[PDB]
Amino acid sequence: CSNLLLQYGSFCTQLNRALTGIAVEQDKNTQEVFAQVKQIYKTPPIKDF
Amino acid sequence: AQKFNGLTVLPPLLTDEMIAQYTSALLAGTITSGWTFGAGPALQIPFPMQMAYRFNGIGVTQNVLYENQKLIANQFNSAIGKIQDSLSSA
Amino acid sequence: RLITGRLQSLQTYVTQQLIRAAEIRASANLAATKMSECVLGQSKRVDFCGKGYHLMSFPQSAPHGVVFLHVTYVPAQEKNFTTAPAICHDGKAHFPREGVFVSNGTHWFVTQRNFYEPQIITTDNTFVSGNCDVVIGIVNNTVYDPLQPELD
Amino acid sequence: GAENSVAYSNNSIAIPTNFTISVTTEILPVSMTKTSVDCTMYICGDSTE
Ligand SMILES: *[C@@H]1O[C@H](CO)[C@@H](O[C@@H]2O[C@H](CO)[C@@H](O)[C@H](O)[C@H]2NC(C)=O)[C@H](O)[C@H]1NC(C)=O
Ligand SMILES: *[C@@H]1O[C@H](CO)[C@@H](O[C@@H]2O[C@H](CO)[C@@H](O)[C@H](O)[C@H]2NC(C)=O)[C@H](O)[C@H]1NC(C)=O
Ligand SMILES: *[C@@H]1O[C@H](CO)[C@@H](O[C@@H]2O[C@H](CO)[C@@H](O)[C@H](O)[C@H]2NC(C)=O)[C@H](O)[C@H]1NC(C)=O
Ligand SMILES: *[C@@H]1O[C@H](CO)[C@@H](O)[C@H](O)[C@H]1NC(C)=O
Numbered sequence: 001c002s003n004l005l006l007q008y009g010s011f012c013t014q015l016n017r018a019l020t021g022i023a024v025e026q027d028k029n030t031q032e033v034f035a036q037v038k039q040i041y042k043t044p045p046i047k048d049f
Numbered sequence: 050a051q052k053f054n055g056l057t058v059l060p061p062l063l064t065d066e067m068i069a070q071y072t073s074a075l076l077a078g079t080i081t082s083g084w085t086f087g088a089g090p091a092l093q094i095p096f097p098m099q100m101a102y103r104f105n106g107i108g109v110t111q112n113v114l115y116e117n118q119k120l121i122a123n124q125f126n127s128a129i130g131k132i133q134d135s136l137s138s139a
Numbered sequence: 140r141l142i143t144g145r146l147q148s149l150q151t152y153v154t155q156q157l158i159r160a161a162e163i164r165a166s167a168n169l170a171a172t173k174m175s176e177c178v179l180g181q182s183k184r185v186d187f188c189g190k191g192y193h194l195m196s197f198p199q200s201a202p203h204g205v206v207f208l209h210v211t212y213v214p215a216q217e218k219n220f221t222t223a224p225a226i227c228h229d230g231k232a233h234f235p236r237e238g239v240f241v242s243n244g245t246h247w248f249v250t251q252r253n254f255y256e257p258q259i260i261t262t263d264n265t266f267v268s269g270n271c272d273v274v275i276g277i278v279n280n281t282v283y284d285p286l287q288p289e290l291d
Numbered sequence: 292g293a294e295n296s297v298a299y300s301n302n303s304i305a306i307p308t309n310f311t312i313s314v315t316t317e318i319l320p321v322s323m324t325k326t327s328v329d330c331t332m333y334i335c336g337d338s339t340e
């Protein structure tokens with residue numbers, strides 16, 4: 001099966017680059033929404049608001 | 050599972066714990082500073098003061114909040130209890 | 140067989156290019172809205188035209204793209220102050236029109252949100268509403284009242 | 292990020308006394324190359340069959 005895959009190795013190269021593209025595009029999605037600030041602000045112990 | 054046929058699942062870069070840490074940092078920033086931390090250094094401010102500025106942004110004078118602050122606080126707590134109850138009932 | 144292989148390659152290329160076209164269209168719509176708001180005027184949307192209080196943007200030509208040189212307004216130095224939401228002068232509660240009451244330890248002033256410009260507590264920048272026993276936190280002070288010394 | 296705590300009180304405020312004019316760079320791609328692909332020259336060479 002692998003010998004005959006060399007005729008379609010370019011198709012898998014597009015596919016692996018596509019799935020890697022989605023995976024890295026998915027990791028960046030969480031960074032653009034939750035990582036708005038670069039400092040963790042601690043909740044004050046006083047809860048009298 | 051769905052991994053026996055080579056369909057491997059790549060774990061996320063950010064786990065649920067630091068995502069919760071991201072939210073809690075944002076929650077603490079928006080209750081102790083308002084919007085100053087989102088556009089520069091964080092500036093300390095009282096929450097009743099901050100509630101008045103949000104009222105000033107919608108065309109309402111800030112004098113009405115301090116007249117009935119207990120009413121708005123009770124309405125906020127009841128609304129928080131309502132959404133928590135509605136989310137408990139997908 | 141060569142025909143069907145070449146058609147498969149062209150179909151997957153056309154699909155990929157059309158997906159890139161959709162992404163480029165989304166980016167182009169975002170860039171057009173950013174130009175029309177941040178460049179052709181001042182946008183009130185916070186953290187849309189850069190980190191800070193937006194003033195304006197300077198668009199520049201780019202090969203197959205566009206860049207924006209936003210002008211933001213971020214504070215640099217801040218000072219801690221003791222504040223009060225209202226002033227009890229003569230049983231009437233005074234509230235600031237656009238500023239906030241601040242104190243340096245001895246006296247009280249009213250200053251704007253994004254800058255420290257201390258001013259004397261006067262009638263022109265404050266308005267009264269109701270009685271004094273309505274706010275949980277209130278402090279006692281006096282109002283300069285710019286009509287009293289001039290009528291003499 | 293940097294773990295810091297914000298001192299919170301019911302009668303404490305922070306009024307800035309100075310400002311710095313900062314300029315932020317943002318990159319938006321709006322264009323790409325426009326290519327045209329035809330079957331007759333790509334799929335076929337110089338053969339009528
Ligand atoms: C708080 O602010 C008040 C009002 O500006 C200051 O009082 C003045 O201080 C200057 C500085 O020497 C004197 O020249 C004035 O005569 C003062 N006026 C009055 C009415 O006292 C006060 O010094 C400030 N306190 C601090 C700690 O900064
Ligand atoms: C602020 O001013 C009010 C009124 O001028 C003060 O209320 C008075 O308090 C004294 C004793 O604390 C009572 O004998 C009076 O009857 C009160 N008058 C009124 C109209 O309530 C209040 O104590 C002052 N606050 C501070 C911190 O000095
Ligand atoms: C606000 O910040 C600016 C930027 O640092 C200050 O300007 C500097 O002031 C010092 C001393 O006056 C000079 O030696 C620098 O050359 C200035 N830098 C620039 C870029 O102008 C300014 O003094 C600060 N203002 C206040 C009131 O503190
Ligand atoms: C003001 O003082 C408080 C405590 O008195 C401190 O926590 C805060 O950091 C101070 N603010 C500044 C800007 O130094």
Ligand SMILES: *[C@@H]1O[C@H](CO)[C@@H](O)[C@H](O)[C@H]1NC(C)=O
Pocket residue numbers: 048275276277301302
């Ligand atoms: C601020 O909170 C403290 C602690 O609960 C309290 O002792 C103080 O009276 C409060 N001050 C005002 C103005 O509400």
